[PDB]
Enzyme design. Structure first.
Site, PDB file in Angstrom:
ATOM      1  N   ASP C  54       0.829  -1.193   0.000  1.00 45.82           N
ATOM      2  CA  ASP C  54       0.000   0.000   0.000  1.00 45.82           C
ATOM      3  C   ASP C  54       0.870   1.251   0.000  1.00 45.82           C
ATOM      4  O   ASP C  54       1.790   1.384   0.812  1.00 45.82           O
ATOM      5  CB  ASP C  54      -0.923   0.002   1.218  1.00 45.82           C
ATOM      6  N   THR C  87      -1.994   6.422  -4.028  1.00 38.88           N
ATOM      7  CA  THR C  87      -1.029   7.439  -3.633  1.00 38.88           C
ATOM      8  C   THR C  87       0.299   7.242  -4.353  1.00 38.88           C
ATOM      9  O   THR C  87       1.083   8.189  -4.482  1.00 38.88           O
ATOM     10  CB  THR C  87      -0.823   7.405  -2.118  1.00 38.88           C
ATOM     11  N   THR C  88       0.570   6.021  -4.822  1.00 37.22           N
ATOM     12  CA  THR C  88       1.775   5.767  -5.603  1.00 37.22           C
ATOM     13  C   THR C  88       1.771   6.551  -6.909  1.00 37.22           C
ATOM     14  O   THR C  88       2.834   6.975  -7.379  1.00 37.22           O
ATOM     15  CB  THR C  88       1.899   4.271  -5.886  1.00 37.22           C
ATOM     16  N   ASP C 385     -10.209   2.508   0.744  1.00 39.84           N
ATOM     17  CA  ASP C 385     -10.183   2.986  -0.634  1.00 39.84           C
ATOM     18  C   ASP C 385     -11.486   2.652  -1.352  1.00 39.84           C
ATOM     19  O   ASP C 385     -11.931   3.408  -2.224  1.00 39.84           O
ATOM     20  CB  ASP C 385      -8.984   2.396  -1.382  1.00 39.84           C
TER      21      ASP C 385
END
Lengths: 446, 516, 520, 98, 107, 65
Positions: C54, C87-88, C385
């Site tokens: 994550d 978020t990556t 999410d």
């Protein structure tokens, strides 16, 4: 000032090495213990001398050794699960997983991605699992044959243990306990008494669920139609002599000094003297398929290890009653699965072929280690098994007695199907976690 | 070959540490063994040749080397003789294993091969032995006497040897029983007198005094063992005694006498006329007030007794340990005909209780002597006499000394290896060559040539028998059967048995792991 | 003071040093991009160990002392509230834009001019996403397709074996705590809990509150159907302190007297429960044997040893108040609920208090079950999410095809529009195109394919084959055109990705000096 | 037999390195092309090969690529014979320069 | 490549002579595989003449004649068909003169 | 050792080693036979060289100064 003052981070180049070097080290640590001719190992804690001991148990070696590497701690925790849950295959899981990562490090050196390796291992594990399912042999009828298989499986579990010399006596104790059970494989109903004196061959047995406890000072040696009330009265705390006579006047059996397992076991399950100690022998109890195995030894260290290896046999033996399927050991199952993977390598995309080829080599390295530890030429025996399994003959294995190849069915070597299944899956799942890892993160320790 | 992984370095590490302990203790073998100098850390220095004492004062730290130290202790418990010969045999077998491992032989094949030599070895020694009659007290006397001549005391062996022969034949059924318990024969000694003055008591003898008790005699005593301390009220937790005036202070004394007498009243109900108080130092084991109440009940005071001394009393009279007065009863009592404390010139204040009248076979030996050393070596010699006699009870046989068993063993094993097949041939030949270290060590200590002595004896054994061995008394090879220098069979058999198991155990060590 | 041994780094070398710090965090996280992302091993300071892929959890545990890296970590606190999953994508895009900027600094362009071009290219790309987007629930509120989107989201997690069940509960949960027409879903009203044992298929929705606390006695009624719940700080018994009573009983003269006063308080308060009309009496502390013996005779269930924050949530969920003492009780301070049940877990004695509403509620808790705590931990974030996926679709049902299809289409628009900007920001716009390709080029790399060949092959397919964008088949499915694979990302998410990425690049570019005093 | 099996695999592995090196020099993914040829020839399709022009696998019979039998036979024999000589040597005796 | 692998086997405690026994057996099965795969042309000389162009295109690869390799496939195959005898190329002369492109090569 | 045991246990006549991996041992069947004068001089020359080397305990050679 990216990671200083205790906090560290291993990049992809180094973390790829540290992840495998930590896991491969644990495999090479206890691979020598694999097989009946396993090599011993000394354990000596630093700072103290009384912690000396010697053993060839792959499970006992991993429990006591501390681990700072996170990749190795995963492989060790996944091994302790096999020891507590299944009771067998703790060493094969650690060796099979490490040999897979050893080959994987050679694949990534060839610019093979870890995800491409994981795809092949998932397809190989299915073909490998399918091989055991086809070669597995169940026994619904012919209880004599099914009883013989339990004796062979008991010898395999007891191999390379303290009781390996006189296993012929303990095979009759463990199998008789599970045979007398004949139903739910709850090991709670199988008590194990430990008393001093006598050699290992003097281990008695009692089918009435004999107890390892003496009660009262002057208790009745016989009670008819006793009604059990645990808290005939049974209590974990000791019963003083004053209430004993009050129960004695009422004819109630005043059982005292029960343990946690005693309350847990007696709930679901005459005086007897074995080993110069008063023991509680039941009879005609509801669900009286229980029993007890009476060990005998010179000290407690002999009886403790006697209980551990014997309990490990009862675990897989109980699992053999719930699943009567059996597979041939001694490198027959490991080599048969490795052959199906090589067949699957013929019908597969490009990079998955080279990854699945390494999955087979990791399985073939298990009998290679069993032969090396025994001193036989592993390259000759293992390569001979390949030519054997490649052209029919799905029974050949290692004959540690003579040091050659022979039919495992005739020699009487076989292992449970669920054990080899979990060993295959737990090893693949363990190595799959390491490949998915590519960067270890260590924050500033407190 | 590449030989990337090198776990064999731990084998050479364990073999070198094991061979080091043997190389030191080698020269101290036999009567002519060269002495060794041990220096304690404080500054004291001593000289000795007993191999058992040297191993204890070595402070061995390596694990493999500690196995040889614990191995030597196993030989002392089982046989009591040949302590130094075991460690020398194990060091040579491991040194011989260093040659086999270089040839590419696995430790498991070497381990299983040595067991076959051990199996054939025990047959070789048992066939060439000399059976004897155990009930015949003539052979046991000369056997221990001639053996005790090789021990420290050579003059007073004729007195202490038959004391041990009768002590064993008394408690052990001659030529019927195979096991013997040395703990069933206690050996008491006190200063004064001489070795000639001794008494093989059929009951028991202790060392402590019954003072300040004035009974001094209790006939038909029902001896009992109580471990709980009899005294006034005591509480380990935080407590406080209340005293309102001098009356309450003196009343507590009346209530303190009651607490001591209340526990004595329960003991009086069982008929226990003699009490065995376990030795205790953490608290007052027997207060002063308890003496008079026990004197009122005509009980003899026996306190400050060791557990091992109570262990001898356990099997002697059949007494059980009692941890609390509430659990004290009559069934846990021994017996005695006439209890008394004798105070002779040199024997001291001994507690002589005769006529046990209980299931058990025990005796006790009283000893006297001028100095502590005169009595010390007397008891040390009785143990070796009892040990060598114990070896004959388990194995009613004899064999020659001077390393002759090792030569017949090494000679015929080389012939046995020619018939074997596989790696067992070289593994058994190496087992045979390792036995030759013992007589070559005896020949070296006797000033002879180590090679020509064993080389000459290997021909005398091929032509003759095991009678040919090294005679250090004359300084050369002689017929040991005529010299009356023999040892029991259990010493040579237990040596090969325990030494080979240690070599097999050390061979199976693949590596050592440091835990925490 | 403390100028001596003061760390300093300035000039153009500082900007390249700041870029090198951001690339270290982007290169670390670009491998964990996509469903086939490589996990990360975390070594906790207290000796604990975990594994996860994550992006938010990696940034939270990443202990970075560099100041530029800490700013990139602070972006996660603002990004997870909107997107949650990727978020990556922001960190990878930010590090990609910074790497391409290093080629422009060598050309002699100012950092502010680079930031001005990315802001211009972001509006070009963000304008392009609004065109190629597509709706799902335009003008009607429906539950059929909305559940299917969340089912592909949980498939990226370890809970993929049980991804089909949790999606339905996720839609009912968000629809319960808030209406789709209101377009205001609050995460504070949503809670997630769980316990070891069972499987993830036993996930359930409890409209109300759940707390791991048991009744005052097993003989209490296991069903409080009436909506009358009292929430006191002390139990209905003789009042006791918070720590220890230490009652002084000298002799029997005080025992019979205090026992009468104590027994009077036992009967007075236990009978006060039915005076106010309360059936259930929840109390912070436990009950005595004398109290439970009287509660049984009156049929008055009660809860014992309820925690501090647990007493607060029960008042909010049931609509009551935290009563400080029994004297303040009233009809208004009684809570409301439809059914109160005690639910055990096999052979474990947890027996959590389950307060059901028997109707639509405004707050819902999510109970998770499984055979491992860390898989339950990762399972909790797997819904967070999903709540954003549902919340984002509720705020705007318009969406864009994921799997890299959006990034490759925007790169073509940004490249063409760069020709129309005659100024030094042109080189930055072309750099924005190449930086957009790093997300899809990273997905193919993590799956084990040739990145550039798979990248450009989808470009020409997006230019020659058809106008609708096409993604990368990273899951090794049949082919491209992720619309068939039903891999669709939200429009607000992609806009926040390019926005937060351009902001994070702008902030790092306008910084040109770091100062900190060292230990003197 | 046992030990001879391992030596045969290295002989096959050496032959497989020829198309690996031909693909590596051309810039293509040699691991995919060579492993695909192995999967092909293992189940029929004894005409597959490399296509350096297009950069993939194709049928050599259709594309029209072939080599003489006498050439490949001598390449196999001259290589194994040459490797046999080097593998048979274990000590080198260097004499004095003149 | 054979010696590169043989060096690895020797590290595995494998003798060189044992490896040669395997390579000799392997060379037999390899030659047998070539014969089963080889396809001669007893008839259809046009198919044979077509194959000779493929031998020239394969042999002439990696040379300077890649610009006009299709031309040299015809010359080398044509000159070989004129010989119809032993492989002695002494009868086949070669001329090296400057001027002109590679496609202008005469026969 | 296997060949040596066969020279005693299996049968008294001498048996060799099958180095060419033929059928079995007993080289008489394989027709591998050496001259008696060959073996007599082989171990004789070998012993004579060992005695000549064992009877040398000093190799003195002057160095260049």
């Amino acid at each position: 000032n990216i990671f200083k003052a205790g906090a560290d981070e291993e990049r992809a180049e180094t973390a790829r090495l540290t992840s495998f070097i930590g896991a491969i080290a644990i495999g090479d640590l206890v691979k020598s213990t694999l097989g009946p001719k396993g090599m011993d190992k000394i354990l000596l804690s630093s700072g103290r001398d009384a912690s000396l001991m010697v053993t060839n148990d792959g499970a006992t070696i991993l429990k006591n050794i501390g681990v700072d590497n996170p990749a190795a701690k995963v492989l060790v925790d996944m091994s302790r699960v096999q020891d507590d849950e299944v009771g067998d295959g703790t060493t094969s899981v650690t060796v099979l997983a490490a040999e897979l990562l050893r080959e994987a490090e050679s694949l990534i050196a060839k610019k093979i991605h870890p995800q491409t390796i994981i795809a092949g291992w998932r397809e190989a594990t299915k073909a490998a699992r399918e091989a055991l399912l086809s070669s597995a042999v169940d026994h619904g009828s012919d209880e004599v044959k099914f009883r013989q298989d339990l004796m062979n499986i008991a010898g395999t579990t007891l191999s390379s243990k303290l009781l390996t010399h006189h296993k012929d006596h303990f095979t009759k104790l463990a199998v008789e306990a599970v045979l007398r059970l004949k139903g739910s494989g709850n090991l709670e109903a199988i008590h194990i008494i430990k008393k001093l004196g006598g050699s290992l061959a003097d281990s008695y047995l009692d089918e009435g669920f004999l107890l390892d406890k003496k009660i009262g000072v002057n208790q009745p040696k016989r009670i008819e139609n006793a009604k059990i009330l645990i808290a005939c009265f049974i209590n974990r705390q000791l019963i003083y002599n004053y209430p004993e006579q009050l129960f004695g006047a009422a004819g109630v059996m005043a059982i005292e000094h029960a343990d946690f397992a005693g309350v847990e076991r007696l709930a679901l399950v005459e005086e007897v003297m074995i080993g110069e100690d008063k023991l509680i022998h039941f009879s005609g109890v509801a669900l009286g398929e229980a029993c007890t195995i009476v060990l005998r030894g010179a000290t407690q260290q002999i009886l403790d290890e006697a209980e551990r290896s014997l309990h490990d046999a009862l675990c897989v033996l109980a699992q053999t009653v719930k699943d009567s399927r059996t597979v041939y050991g001694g490198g027959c199952s490991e080599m048969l699965m490795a052959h199906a993977v090589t067949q699957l390598a013929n019908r597969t995309p490009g990079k998955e072929a080279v990854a699945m080829e390494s999955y087979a080599k990791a399985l073939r390295m298990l009998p290679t280690i069993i032969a090396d530890n025994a001193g036989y030429d592993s390259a000759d025996l293992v390569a001979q098994l390949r030519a054997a399994h490649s052209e029919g003959n799905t029974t050949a294995g290692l004959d540690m007695r003579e040091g050659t190849i022979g039919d495992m069915a005739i020699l009487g070597i076989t292992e449970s199907f669920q054990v080899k299944r979990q060993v295959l899956l737990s090893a693949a799942e363990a190595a799959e976690v390491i490949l998915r890892v590519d960067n270890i993160i260590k924050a500033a320790p407190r | 070959y590449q030989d990337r992984d090198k776990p064999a370095q731990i084998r050479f590490s364990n073999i070198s540490a094991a061979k080091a302990v043997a190389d030191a203790i080698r020269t101290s073998l036999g009567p002519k063994g060269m002495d060794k100098m041990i220096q304690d850390g404080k500054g004291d220095v001593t000289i000795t040749n007993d191999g058992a004492t040297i191993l204890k004062q070595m402070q061995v730290l390596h694990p493999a080397a500690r196995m040889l130290v614990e191995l030597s202790k196993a030989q002392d418990i089982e046989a009591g003789d040949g302590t130094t010969s075991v460690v020398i045999i194990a060091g040579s077998l491991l040194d011989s294993c260093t040659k086999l491992l270089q040839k590419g032989i696995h430790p498991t094949i070497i381990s299983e091969s040595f067991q076959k030599a051990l199996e054939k070895g025990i047959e070789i020694l048992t066939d060439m032995s000399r059976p004897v009659e155990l009930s015949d007290r003539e052979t046991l006397l000369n056997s221990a006497t001639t053996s005790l001549n090789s021990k420290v005391v050579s003059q007073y062996s004729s007195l202490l040897s038959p004391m041990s022969v009768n002590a064993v034949m008394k408690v052990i059924d001659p030529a019927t029983a195979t096991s013997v318990d040395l703990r069933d024969i206690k050996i008491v000694k006190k200063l004064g007198g001489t070795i000639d003055d001794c008494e093989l008591v059929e009951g028991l003898v202790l060392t402590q005094k019954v003072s300040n008790s004035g009974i001094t005699r209790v006939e038909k005593a029902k001896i009992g063992l109580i471990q709980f301390c009899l005294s006034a009220p005591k509480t380990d937790m935080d407590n406080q005694i209340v005293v309102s005036d001098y009356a309450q202070m003196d009343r507590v004394l009346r209530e303190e006498r009651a607490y001591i007498l209340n526990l004595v009243k329960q003991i009086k109900k069982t008929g226990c006329n003699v009490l065995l108080i376990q030795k205790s130092i953490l608290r007052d084991a027997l207060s002063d007030l308890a003496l008079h109440f026990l004197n009122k009940m005509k009980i003899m005071v026996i306190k400050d007794i060791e557990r091992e001394d109570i262990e001898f009393i356990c099997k002697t009279i059949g007494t059980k340990p009692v941890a609390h007065i509430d659990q004290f009863t009559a069934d846990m009592l021994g017996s005695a005909e006439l209890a008394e404390e004798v105070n002779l010139n040199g024997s001291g204040k001994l507690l002589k209780i005769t006529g046990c009248a209980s299931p058990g076979k025990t005796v006790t030996i009283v000893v006297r002597g001028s100095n502590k050393l005169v009595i010390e070596e007397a008891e040390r010699s009785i143990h070796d006499a009892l040990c060598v006699i114990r070896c004959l009870v388990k194995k009613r046989a004899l064999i020659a000394g001077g390393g002759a068993p090792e030569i017949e063993l090494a000679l015929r094993l080389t012939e046995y290896s020619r018939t074997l097949s596989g790696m067992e041939s070289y593994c058994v030949r190496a087992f045979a060559d390792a036995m030759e270290v013992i007589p070559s060590t005896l020949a070296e200590n006797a000033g002879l040539n180590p090679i020509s002595t064993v080389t000459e004896l290997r021909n005398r054994h091929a032509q003759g028998e095991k009678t040919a061995g090294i005679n250090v008394r004359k300084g050369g090879i002689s017929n040991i059967l005529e010299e009356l220098v023999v040892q029991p069979l259990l010493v040579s058999v237990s040596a090969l048995t325990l030494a080979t198991e240690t070599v097999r155990s050390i061979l199976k060590i693949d590596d050592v792991v440091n835990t925490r | 003071k403390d100028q001596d041994r003061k760390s300093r780094l300035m000039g153009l070398e500082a900007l390249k040093s700041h870029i090198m710090a951001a690339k270290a965090v982007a290169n670390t996280m670009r491998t964990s991009l996509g469903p086939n992302g490589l996990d990360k091993m975390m070594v906790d300071k207290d000796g604990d160990v975990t594994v996860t892929n994550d992006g938010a959890t990696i940034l939270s545990m990443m202990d970075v002392d560099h100041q530029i890296a800490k700013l990139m970590v602070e972006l996660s606190k603002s990004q997870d509230d909107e997107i949650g999953d990727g978020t990556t994508g922001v960190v990878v895009l930010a590090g990609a834009l910074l790497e391409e900027a290093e080629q422009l600094l060598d050309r002699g362009i100012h950092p502010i001019r680079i930031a001005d071009g990315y802001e211009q290219a972001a509006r070009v790309a963000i304008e392009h996403l609004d065109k190629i987007s597509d709706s799902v629930l335009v003008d009607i509120k429906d539950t059929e397709p909305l559940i299917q989107t969340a089912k592909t989201t949980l498939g990226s997690k370890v809970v993929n074996s049980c991804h089909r069940q949790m999606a339905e509960i996720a839609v009912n949960a968000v629809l319960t705590v808030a209406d789709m027409e209101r377009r205001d879903v609050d995460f504070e009203l949503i809670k997630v809990e769980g316990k070891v044992g069972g499987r993830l298929e036993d996930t359930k929705l409890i409209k109300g509150v759940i707390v791991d606390k048991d009744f005052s006695h097993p003989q209490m009624p296991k069903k409080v159907e009436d909506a009358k719940i009292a929430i006191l700080t002390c139990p209905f018994e003789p009042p006791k302190p918070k720590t220890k009573h230490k009652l002084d009983v000298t002799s029997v003269e005080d025992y019979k007297a205090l026992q009468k006063y104590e027994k009077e308080k036992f009967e007075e308060m236990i009978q006060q429960i039915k005076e106010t009309g309360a059936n259930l009496a929840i109390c912070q502390w436990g009950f005595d044997d004398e109290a439970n013996h009287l509660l049984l005779q009156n049929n008055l269930p009660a809860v014992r040893w309820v925690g501090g924050p647990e007493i607060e949530l029960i008042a909010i969920a049931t609509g009551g108040r935290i009563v400080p003492r029994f004297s303040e009780l009233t009809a208004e301070k009684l809570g409301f609920a439809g059914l109160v049940q005690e639910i055990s877990f096999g052979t474990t004695k947890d027996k959590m208090l389950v307060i059901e509403q028997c109707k639509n509620s405004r707050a819902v808790t999510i109970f998770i079950r499984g055979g491992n705590k860390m898989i339950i931990e990762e399972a909790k974030r797997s819904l967070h999410d999903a709540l954003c996926v549902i919340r984002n679709l509720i705020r705007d049902n318009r969406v864009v095809y994921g799997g890299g299809a959006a990034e490759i289409s925007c790169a073509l628009a940004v490249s063409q529009e760069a020709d129309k900007c005659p100024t030094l920001e042109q080189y930055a716009m072309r750099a924005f195109a190449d930086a957009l390709e790093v997300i899809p080029m990273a997905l193919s790399e993590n799956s084990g394919m040739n990145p550039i060949q798979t990248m450009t092959e989808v470009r020409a397919r997006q230019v020659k084959e058809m106008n609708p964008a096409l993604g990368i088949d990273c899951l090794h499915k049949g082919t491209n055109d992720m619309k068939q694979q039903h891999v669709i990302e939200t429009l607000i998410g992609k806009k926040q990705q390019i926005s937060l990425a351009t902001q994070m690049v702008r902030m790092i570019l306008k910084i040109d000096d770091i100062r900190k005093p060292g230990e003197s």
